[PDB]
Design a binder for this molecule. Structure first.
Ligand SMILES: O=P(O)(O)Oc1cc[n+]([C@@H]2O[C@H](COP(=O)(O)OP(=O)(O)OP(=O)(O)O)[C@@H](O)[C@H]2O)c(O)n1
Ligand SMILES: O=P(O)(O)Oc1cc[n+]([C@@H]2O[C@H](COP(=O)(O)OP(=O)(O)OP(=O)(O)O)[C@@H](O)[C@H]2O)c(O)n1
Ligand SMILES: O=P(O)(O)Oc1cc[n+]([C@@H]2O[C@H](COP(=O)(O)OP(=O)(O)OP(=O)(O)O)[C@@H](O)[C@H]2O)c(O)n1
Ligand SMILES: Nc1nc2c(ncn2[C@H]2C[C@H](O)[C@@H](COP(=O)(O)OP(=O)(O)OP(=O)(O)O)O2)c(=O)[nH]1
Ligand SMILES: Nc1nc2c(ncn2[C@H]2C[C@H](O)[C@@H](COP(=O)(O)OP(=O)(O)OP(=O)(O)O)O2)c(=O)[nH]1
Ligand SMILES: Nc1nc2c(ncn2[C@H]2C[C@H](O)[C@@H](COP(=O)(O)OP(=O)(O)OP(=O)(O)O)O2)c(=O)[nH]1
Ligand SMILES: Nc1ncnc2c1ncn2[C@H]1C[C@H](O)[C@@H](COP(=O)(O)OP(=O)(O)O)O1
Ligand SMILES: Nc1ncnc2c1ncn2[C@H]1C[C@H](O)[C@@H](COP(=O)(O)OP(=O)(O)O)O1
Ligand SMILES: Nc1ncnc2c1ncn2[C@H]1C[C@H](O)[C@@H](COP(=O)(O)OP(=O)(O)O)O1
Ligand SMILES: [Mg+2]
Ligand SMILES: [Mg+2]
Ligand SMILES: [Mg+2]
Ligand SMILES: [Mg+2]
Ligand SMILES: [Mg+2]
Ligand SMILES: [Mg+2]
Ligand SMILES: [Mg+2]
Ligand SMILES: [Mg+2]
Ligand SMILES: [Mg+2]
Ligand SMILES: [Mg+2]
Ligand SMILES: [Mg+2]
Ligand SMILES: [Mg+2]
Lengths: 556, 556, 556
């Protein structure tokens, strides 16, 4: 088994995830089987209790585990089905070791960090690396990404464990790629190599040595900077790879190939990769990059989301929208709209921003209402849903968007002006959205309806059923804790809406649709987690087609 | 609240525990209330699963917690009743934080080490420091001892937490004493200050600074060495305290007083200790040190123990024996005898060692059989018990010694040659000692009969009942997992033995005695944990008096 | 005496020099006397042997010492006359200590780094801080700038020396300001505090602690970033000062004042600065900043220099040009022109660049030919001088510019097509510029005509004599090693040129002028080193006035 370790330089947003995903893509292009392990030095057992601002959107796996978006990147670039054990956190290791000690496995000796925690980390890595991830495939290469930067107090156990690991499995099976930042201050005007030198010195003090130095900058650096880095890092001139800011992340594998990363890894790790056959290996990615470069027609989708201030809080959403837009030869113009600024309270505070956001929402061909938590920005989601339903603008709501759509429908069409969710208004006369009884045991974190489920399509002609391929039932991943009230659904269905998606029990409904309006579809689950570059999610594809006025043509 | 931190230098056997206990003794002599917190950077929840070789004898607290011998030193020098929360381990903090995160206390943000683990450590220290420990007394000074040495990967969270703590509570409430070793190699022939300089440099790199430098050596160091340490550690000449190897640990408080530690701490910590009243404060300790220096009459006790290779594995037993010997103006000659070398197997392997150990056992005025775990050396305990019972040599057995005495009595007097414990021989025809059903749930660590219990004295004249003061029932601390079989006890009592100690249910017997032999007493509990310098344990005092042929005189 | 230490963060171009100069300006506005010491951890005795690319333009002091441009910034912002001892290098300290040891001052003991090198550094700082620098003024505050970044192997002696120094002079006399960089990567899109945290951790490990944290960024950072820095650096919220990229360096003192730096330093260093009187203190700098903001009229000067790739290689030149431009209410449009691209060889290689640079040179109102070393780009200087003399474009040549002008004059007007300098063509038939015999002893570094000298104005009406104020002789600083041949000067003076500047011996001529051409002045010395914000250099002022066609009006 061969291992690649990707460590961090001076910042944690440097791009380790993209580098590791590109390593996996290159190694799978050759023909190998690649595993991916994400190491999160934080103590949370899972990521189900994170704000989207802290590290980005929270991914939901197939078994219900909530993990980082790095696992989403791994699944998107590698088309593999990861498990709960592909994410390693400090809390997991410490809980495991504490339980083992309490049971009596370590009887006689004291449990320490270096002999016991590091041993548990190494055993976890070795056991997970061999776990099949694409079916019956036996993996050949494991890519481990260390979250954070070198020098943190949280990463010390992991760097010590890998310092022992490189000798446990010999140097021919272990490689280490270091990703660093090369700032180019405007006032100074020249690229600076000092932070990279400090990072390399810290990594050498920790007992490791970078086989590769990936220098990340905004613009290509000169040969003087690269030579300086090679001299002051004790690394070969051809062992330093310069990756600058590219148009899309699809160019990163191509950039690393043109920098000869595959050849260096094949000689360094003894992968026995033959050069003759591996020609035109990245044809799918080259075609995708060319299509991203050569899309002229414009499609505009407005995202009424409450996590707009950070652009990576809707990573999977943006990626699914991009996949759908590329699948129809359209250039996705994404306008992020804070749902808070669409509320009437903003009008009494910042009229200019309110009008600017409303006119941004009014000039878009489509609207998307993703999920979220809390009560802030939910009224703006209601207002956007109301406007879209009134003016026949196509809209796609996800999780919280479905609840907002139901609230708007009940408040306007049914006249129940007091309709609200128990999440926001527990004392509601007409609790349109209520709580699922078995997911409020007072223990936040891994206690909702999580993972794959089964959604039953109702008996009746619905275009959303067509969009998926006219099936009887479909499977998707859920991240919801509240559900709509059955009794009002009986009323809402009669008036103007069609609940066309439910579960086997026909008690938990998931998909709503309306007669009249061309495309007004809301989902309780997240269709975005199953989107791949060549497999755009059918809901997003339908939203794009309706936005560009091509849905009817695609139907026939 | 005032805090004193005692950190380690180049070795962990340097003497931090004695220094902290002496600090507590000095501060309690002035009149203050002193708490003690022991920080163990290991991950074990408690010390119930430690070998005696790793750190020494394992102490049992009043509530059942098994802790380090440092807590025993604290209770012996301070006469306080510590609790489970006076020991801090890495496992405790990590388990606490993991449970808090899982419940939902840290919702929204990732749990890290510096903002969360260190905060939990500081909250634990602040909450435990204020917990009453001598009754209704509100503590004034907390003495925290950091286990290990500065620079360990395990101690990094604690040193970071205390680096923040010194500024959280201001420098006037926080003091740091550093204990270092000054080696004097025979070949080199001169004291070396370099290890102390390296330790000080590491401590300053960690963000702390030693208010005191305690230099530990075997012989007093010259003024040149002390001046060198003061110059190269950036510490004042009078701020370095030299403690050498003394006859007894009772001299350490006196040595630190004659080095002016109390005055420096009073000025540095603003303790407002008045100089005029505090005269003749350490009169008990000065008297005890003089008595240790001026004991001429000789008493010899042989310890048939399996943990002889390390002299600190019987710390509490040795201290109780010393207290009893000093209470009768006798000098305790302690000869440690490995019970393995008293077995007939050693005779066929090392006859010289077998004869040497047997003649060491034969020239002693008394024998002590302490407790232990495992099957190694148990046959030697049986042989020693048999010889003592045959030749009328006084003997005191503790825990495993009681089971050994029962086994010997059944095998010899009752003729049951197959008598054995289930701990060693589960397939026994006559299981003289069996297992308690409720303490084998397959979870080692805090699952025995632990802590204070109640022992009922049987209705009948027994000298052990007198030795305690002729009570009806007494309370002691238990660390046993196996108990003797009731049915054979009915036979054993009839033949020659008197089971004079049981529990309230009259089903778990604890103390044995036999007619004839002057002093042959065995206990299921540990009497040594309740011994104090002015309160010797009555069993040990009786053993000493019987050894020196003074028990009959003391009776009347 | 009070000391301020300015240390470096993650890069050495962060702006420590501007921060220290602004500290000095603020402290001198209050009324104190401020010294400045620049510490260069390199081993060069002086900066006379540096490339302009390594750290920038090399400054020449009054006594002949060649120092860094930081001393030029100190003299420009403080209007003080520094000495050779205001620059501390590693070579200086080590040479001093080695000479002392060889003489016998350290007899008996070995000379080490911590007790001896650091002691020499501290003695140097203490002795130089008290040296008068503005006349008879006794200094009150010394500002020490540490070159480089914290963590370098070269800076370890100096950081150790200052760690002892802060306790030698007590904390009330010592303050430490840390300047760090806060990158905002385009891909990541958010400011990053991790490099600042790492720098603070390294500085705390070195034994120091930043009283101030100056965060340098390109755009103002949000309050979240500042709060994160305050939390993770253990520094107060108001102790973090954010300085972003400003229009001119004159805004930095005003920015630090509006951030309340003066008040914090007055309370921290006990400067006893009264608040009531110090009103409108920075009126000169506020007026200068407003004038820099409010200059509309355009003046264009082309710099034909060979060190164009780095914009700081002509720091003093650009500053003198800016002072002259501001003194006439004109906005200086500076176009840097590589003299290499003006050569005919570039025409045969890159015709586009050759034509672009020639048309950049042709659209400027004036030309400046600064000094330099080597032969590269000298032919381009000749071509630019020839074009300017032919087309009546005003030109100012410095040092090498005077030699280029003489070469062009001899080659064209006198017809000596083989005229060249001995510096470039030692085997010259007509050596127009030759070597000074006493400055080629084979020892590069402090061996030229350096420091202040005396220049004698020739008997005859010359406009350059007027520009200075019609004196008889003037004093300037020299950095030249070659001088023109006297015999050809006799011929050139007759033809069309007037050598109007010589020395007392009337053998070393310094200033040339030509009849006809409005403004063609060349100087052997550097007038730029004596330029101050309110005292623009008369040569640069005359060049600007001739460029904007106002010289004749200014004459009368
Ligand atoms: O992102 P990945 O792929 O490396 O995955 C990552 C990134 C980071 N982490 C952890 O988060 C903590 C602080 O994070 P962080 O680096 O952002 O520091 P900060 O204090 O926020 O400073 P800054 O301003 O630079 O953000 C650290 O204990 C680490 C994990 O577990 N996985
Ligand atoms: O004793 P205290 O009062 O400080 O209480 C102590 C002493 C030590 N410890 C912990 O034990 C581990 C190794 O112990 P240790 O220092 O003995 O190292 P080692 O590898 O055995 O080397 P060595 O040959 O010098 O013994 C370390 O993680 C520490 C604890 O938790 N409390
Ligand atoms: O500038 P000042 O005011 O601090 O004055 C300065 C700046 C720097 N230095 C010294 O120069 C060496 C490398 O310089 P340097 O920081 O530029 O490192 P590098 O290898 O070139 O990396 P990078 O790419 O970041 O430039 C170091 O030994 C230091 C001095 O003596 N004075
Ligand atoms: N608010 C909330 N968060 C949950 C819940 N279950 C899991 N989580 C996670 C999602 C959220 O990203 C995170 C809470 O952090 P935040 O306070 O930032 O959530 P929220 O989106 O409501 O932001 P906000 O407080 O409204 O500004 O915990 C839940 O039941 N309620
Ligand atoms: N053997 C044993 N140890 C226990 C038990 N419960 C708690 N402990 C602790 C006491 C022991 O000091 C420690 C085990 O470490 P050791 O192997 O050194 O114990 P032991 O005294 O038997 O030494 P030995 O293996 O015979 O050389 O676990 C138990 O039921 N059996
Ligand atoms: N070439 C040269 N440099 C000197 C002399 N005396 C002092 N110095 C300094 C100035 C220069 O900046 C430095 C030499 O470094 P460089 O090679 O970069 O100088 P130069 O301007 O000629 O650059 P170049 O080699 O032409 O690309 O030494 C001298 O006599 N000749
Ligand atoms: N070479 C590159 N060019 C352009 N964008 C990049 C890039 N590498 C990464 N990115 C983008 C993708 C991510 O959203 C962000 C960096 O985060 P990341 O790639 O997940 O790394 P990390 O896991 O270290 O944060 O910037
Ligand atoms: N000053 C002194 N003189 C003689 N013996 C000492 C001493 N200080 C400590 N000792 C003994 C008592 C202990 O058994 C051993 C050191 O261990 P300790 O005092 O518990 O410190 P630590 O907790 O650092 O191991 O040596
Ligand atoms: N706050 C600020 N805004 C704009 N430019 C600045 C600035 N501070 C410094 N600069 C410019 C001036 C210098 O040429 C360069 C930084 O170099 P410097 O100020 O001499 O510091 P250092 O000595 O650390 O290199 O950037
Ligand atoms: Mg990340
Ligand atoms: Mg990542
Ligand atoms: Mg962050
Ligand atoms: Mg919330
Ligand atoms: Mg110990
Ligand atoms: Mg101890
Ligand atoms: Mg040990
Ligand atoms: Mg065992
Ligand atoms: Mg500089
Ligand atoms: Mg500088
Ligand atoms: Mg540099
Ligand atoms: Mg040269």
């Amino acid at each position: 088994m061969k291992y690649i370790l990707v460590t961090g330089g001076v910042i944690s947003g440097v791009g380790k995830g993209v580098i590791a995903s590109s390593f996996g893509t290159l190694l799978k292009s050759c023909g190998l089987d690649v595993t991916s392990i994400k190491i999160d030095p934080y103590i949370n057992i899972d990521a189900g209790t994170f704000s989207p601002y802290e590290h980005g959107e929270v991914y939901v796996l197939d078994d219900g585990a909530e993990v980082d978006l790095d696992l989403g990147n791994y699944e998107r670039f590698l088309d593999v089905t990861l498990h709960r054990d592909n994410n390693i956190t400090t809390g997991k290791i410490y809980k495991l070791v504490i339980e083992k000690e309490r049971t009596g496995e370590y009887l006689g000796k004291t449990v320490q960090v270096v002999p016991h925690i590091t041993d548990a980390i190494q055993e976890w890595v070795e056991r997970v690396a061999q776990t099949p991830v694409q079916g019956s495939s036996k993996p050949q290469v494991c890519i481990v990404e260390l979250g954070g930067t070198i020098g943190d107090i949280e990463g010390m156990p992991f760097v010590e464990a890998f310092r022992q690991f490189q000798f446990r499995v010999k140097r021919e099976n272990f490689c280490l790629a270091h990703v660093s930042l090369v700032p180019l201050p405007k006032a100074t005007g020249e690229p600076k190599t000092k932070p990279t030198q400090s990072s390399v010195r810290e990594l050498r003090g920790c007992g490791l040595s970078p086989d590769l130095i990936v220098c990340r900058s905004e613009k290509p650096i000169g040969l003087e900077v690269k030579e300086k880095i090679s001299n002051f890092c004790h690394v070969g001139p051809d062992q330093v790879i310069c990756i600058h800011d590219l148009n899309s992340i699809y160019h990163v594998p191509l950039l690393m190939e043109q920098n000869g990363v595959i050849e260096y890894l094949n000689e360094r790790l003894q992968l026995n990769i033959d050069m003759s056959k591996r020609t035109k290996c990245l044809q799918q990615w080259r075609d995708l990059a060319r299509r991203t470069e050569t899309v002229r027609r414009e499609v505009c989708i407005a995202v009424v989301g409450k996590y707009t201030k950070f652009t990576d809080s809707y990573a999977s959403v943006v990626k699914a929208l991009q996949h759908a837009a590329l699948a129809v030869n359209r250039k996705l113009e994404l306008v992020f709209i804070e749902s808070c600024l669409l509320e009437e309270e903003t009008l009494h505070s910042e009229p200019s921003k309110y009008h600017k956001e409303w006119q941004k929402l009014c000039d878009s061909h489509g609207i998307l209402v993703p999920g979220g938590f809390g009560s802030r920005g939910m009224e703006g989601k209601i207002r956007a849903c109301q406007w879209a339903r009134e003016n026949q603008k196509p809209l796609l709501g996800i999780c919280l968007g479905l609840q907002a759509a139901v609230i708007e429908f009940a408040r306007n069409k049914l006249g129940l002006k007091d309709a609200n969710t128990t999440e926001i208004d527990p004392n509601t006369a007409n609790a349109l959205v209520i709580d699922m009884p078995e997911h409020h045991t007072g223990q936040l974190g891994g206690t909702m309806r999580l993972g794959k489920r089964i959604t039953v399509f109702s008996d009746g002609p619905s275009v959303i059923r067509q969009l998926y391929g006219n099936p009887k039932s479909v499977q998707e991943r859920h991240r919801h804790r509240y559900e709509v009230n059955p009794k009002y659904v009986h009323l809402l269905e009669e008036q103007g809406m069609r609940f066309v998606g439910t579960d086997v029990d026909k008690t938990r409904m998931e998909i709503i649709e309306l007669s009249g309006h061309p495309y007004f579809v809301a989902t309780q689950y997240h269709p975005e987690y199953l989107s791949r570059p060549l497999k755009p999610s059918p809901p997003f594809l339908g939203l794009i087609l309706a936005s560009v006025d091509r849905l009817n043509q695609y139907i026939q």
